[PDB]
Amino acid sequence: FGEGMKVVAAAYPDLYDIIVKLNDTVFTGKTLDYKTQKLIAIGIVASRCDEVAIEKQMKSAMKELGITKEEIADVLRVVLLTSGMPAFTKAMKILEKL
Amino acid sequence: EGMKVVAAAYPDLYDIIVKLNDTVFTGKTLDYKTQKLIAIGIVASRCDEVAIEKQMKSAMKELGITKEEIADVLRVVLLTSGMPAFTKAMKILEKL
Amino acid sequence: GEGMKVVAAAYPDLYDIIVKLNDTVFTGKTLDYKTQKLIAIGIVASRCDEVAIEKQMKSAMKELGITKEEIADVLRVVLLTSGMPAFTKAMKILEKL
Amino acid sequence: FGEGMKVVAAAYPDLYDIIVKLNDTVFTGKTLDYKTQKLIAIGIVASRCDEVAIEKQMKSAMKELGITKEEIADVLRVVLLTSGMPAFTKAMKILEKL
Amino acid sequence: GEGMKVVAAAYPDLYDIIVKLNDTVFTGKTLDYKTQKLIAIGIVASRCDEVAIEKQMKSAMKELGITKEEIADVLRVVLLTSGMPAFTKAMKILEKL
Amino acid sequence: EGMKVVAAAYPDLYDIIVKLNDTVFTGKTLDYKTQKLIAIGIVASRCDEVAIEKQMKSAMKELGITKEEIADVLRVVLLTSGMPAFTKAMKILEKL
């Protein structure tokens, strides 16, 4: 996890621990694999305005799971349809710079 | 219907919407099912219950996407978007 | 609205400022009220509150004689800026209005 | 918790349990009391479009904590300033009907 | 934009439909392009993406000769529909533009 | 400044914004501090980092609201709004 979660670990250890368990359970799908769920997470975050959140989801996916920029771009096609040009173009620019 | 009126009244707009849809869902590497699961996650992260119900229903009917698959998407909605979105979407799923 | 009827009854200072806010917002330096009301439609149509969308559209048509095709021109912008879910919800609302 | 959470209890017991722990920890503030936090929760939910979520937060607050409609109305004043007339008027109407 | 330059290079079919979408959206049945572009400003100003806001405003001023007071009339509507945070962010963007 | 320009260019608008603010924060029963904590929660549930940082800074400076109090608000943001909003706001808080 990123800087935000390290602050939580420092400030509120028990809350941190419950968040980690939540995260680990969320990403233990019954049918969908972790890669698919992380692609979904990218889509959701990219549909909103948090540029740093978008960069971090994309970076972690590529680093941790080996997700490609081509796979991310396919996620962004869905962002365009669901969410419009502003979200799409912002996300595409972030992907390009990664 | 709804798009049925767009087709009749605004044929150019309708034609470009059909093409936008078709092109979006012609992925370079991810398949259509994966893209539709992403679409469900995005819509479920918001408050439009109709979009959510419609998105889920179409996915199940058109693609054979399962309720368990949808629930796996909703897990991600909880983490990204919080309890209200998650519990609303789970209630919707249960009625399908 | 029902919301505003009770605000007027129960919270007269808040109601007073709300009316004045509305009046001042819609007293543009350059843009006319029709243009501003079309902008308002676009903004609420870009979001998920069906009631707000139906109310902005219905008041526009009633107050200003705005047509469904004019509202649809607004919804074109909603599609581009906001995506298919917002567009399709708002277009169904418009059609049924 | 409401119908959504009962579905989660039925479908995913371990996920349900982690959510309950998260909830209980979130509402164990270090300084702010539970009433204050629930008023904040009303504000946040009311700032968005989920009418059912708004009705449920308000109902539970009034039932569980004895929060008044006058206190909720003061929350909604802040919703107006932060979020605009649509959110304010929708929330006020829901409060009125409660 | 940078986003669109790479889409054009890498994804020509998607780029093609995006351009056509834009062109069709901004070919209104009744409303003119200026009105539609003001609506677009209002919608993106109601949300949190500063880049989109700066881009819509800058293109409006450049393409259409839209003035800061005209944009401010849009922002009046943003305040009413969307609240102080959106209004103040967008007004600062406008002022600095 | 930003509102400083509004004051000069659009005096009626400015005057009504000041009154809206003042009236909103004249609660019938809740105090100003409680209302400002609510405001922090609402803004933090969204993506505008500047609004969040400004809201927190003003609250601490104007009202003596503490970082621990702000963190208690952010707990509610996590539950209502998810991890991204929570972790972003915690990162902002840490720098204040």
Q: Domain limits of chain D?
A: 1-98
Among chain A residues, the shortest Cα distance to C80 is held by: A84
Give the distance from CA F12 to its chain's centroid: 24
B48 has a chain D CB within 8 A of its CB: yes
CA distances from E97 to A72, B2, E86, E89, F9 (A): 32, 40, 16, 12, 16
**Which residues of chain B does A40 touch, with a Cβ-Cβ cutoff of 8 Å?**
37-38, 41, 73, 76
Q: Do C72 and E46 touch (CB under 8 A)?
A: no
Inter-chain residue contact E3 with A92, CB threshold 8 Å: yes
Which tokens sit at A39? 């692609």
Amino acid at E90: A
Cβ density class D17-47: b for 16+ within 10 Å, e for less: ebbebbeebbbebeebeeebbbbbbbbbbbb
- Whether B44 contacts chain C with CB within 8 A: no
C43 touches chain A (CB under 8 A): no
d(CA D84, CA C47): 12
Residues 6 or more apart in contact with residue F8 via CB below 8 angstroms:
none
Looking up tokens 């609510």, which residue turns up? F38
Q: With contact defined as beta carbons under 8 Å apart, do B74 and B93 qualify? A: yes
Q: Considering CB atoms only, which of E81, E84, E86 is closest to D85?
A: E81
Helical residues (DSSP H) of chain B, grouped into ranges: 3-9, 11-24, 32-44, 49-63, 67-81, 83-95
Arch. (CATH architecture) of F1-96: Up-down Bundle (1.20)
Q: CB distance from C83 to chain A under 8 Å?
A: yes
Tell me how close the Cα of F63 comes to any Cα of chain C, in angstroms: 23
F85 vs A contacts (CB less than 8 Å): 50
For residue E93, what are the CA distances in angstroms to A58, D83, E48, E89, E96?
28, 19, 12, 6, 5
**F13 close to E (CB below 8 A):** yes
Residue in E69, E79, E91 nearest the CB of F2? E91
Our CA angle for C54, C60, C64, nearest 5°, is 160
Closest to C89 measured CA to CA, from B46, A49, D45: B46
Other C-beta atoms closer than 10 Å to the C-beta of B82 total 25
**Does the beta-carbon distance from F50 to E89 stay under 8 Å?**
yes
Chain E residues whose CB is inside 8 A of the B28 CB are 11
Structure tokens at A80: 């365009």
Q: Is C83 on the interface with E (CB under 8 A)?
A: no
| Helix orientation angle between C12-25 and D69-83, rounded to the nearest 10 degrees | 20
Query: Domain C1-97 belongs to what topology?
Result: AhpD-like (1.20.1290)
Residue F67 forms contact with A (CB below 8 Å): no
CB atoms within 10 A of CB A21: 16
Nearest to E77 by CA among E39, E51, E48, E49: E39
Chain C stretch 19-38, residues whose beta carbon is closer than 8 A to a beta carbon of chain E: 21-22, 24-26, 28-31, 35-36, 38
Inter-residue contact D26 to F81 (CB < 8 Å)? no
The angle subtended at Cα A72 by Cα A66 and Cα A76, nearest 5°, is: 165
Contact F90 A50 (CB under 8 A): no
A53, A98, D71, F28, F68 from A63: Cα distances, Å: 15, 11, 48, 53, 34
From chain E, the residues in CB contact with F47 under 8 A are 48
Q: What 3-state DSSP class applies to C65?
A: coil
Chains B, D: CB contacts within 8 A come to 42
- Which of C42, C67, C79 is opposite residue E42, by nearest beta carbon? C42
Q: A: neighbours with 3+ CB pairs under 8 Å?
A: B, C, D, E, F
- Return the CATH number of A1-98, one of 3.30.420.10, 1.20.1290.10, 3.40.50.300, 2.40.70.10: 1.20.1290.10
Nearest CA in chain C to E73: C28
Give CA–CA dist E57/E48, Å, rounded. Answer: 15
Q: Between helices B49-63 and B67-81, what is the axis angle to 10°? A: 150
> In this structure, what token pair is assigned to residue D65?
């904590």
Taking the Cβ of residue D80 and every Cβ of chain E, the question of whether any pair is shorter than 8 Å is answered with yes
Experimental method: X-ray
Which helix (H) or strand (E) segment is E40 a member of? helix E33-45
Q: Which residues fall within 8 angstroms of residue B51, CB to CB, at 6 or more apart?
A: B43, C85, C88, C89
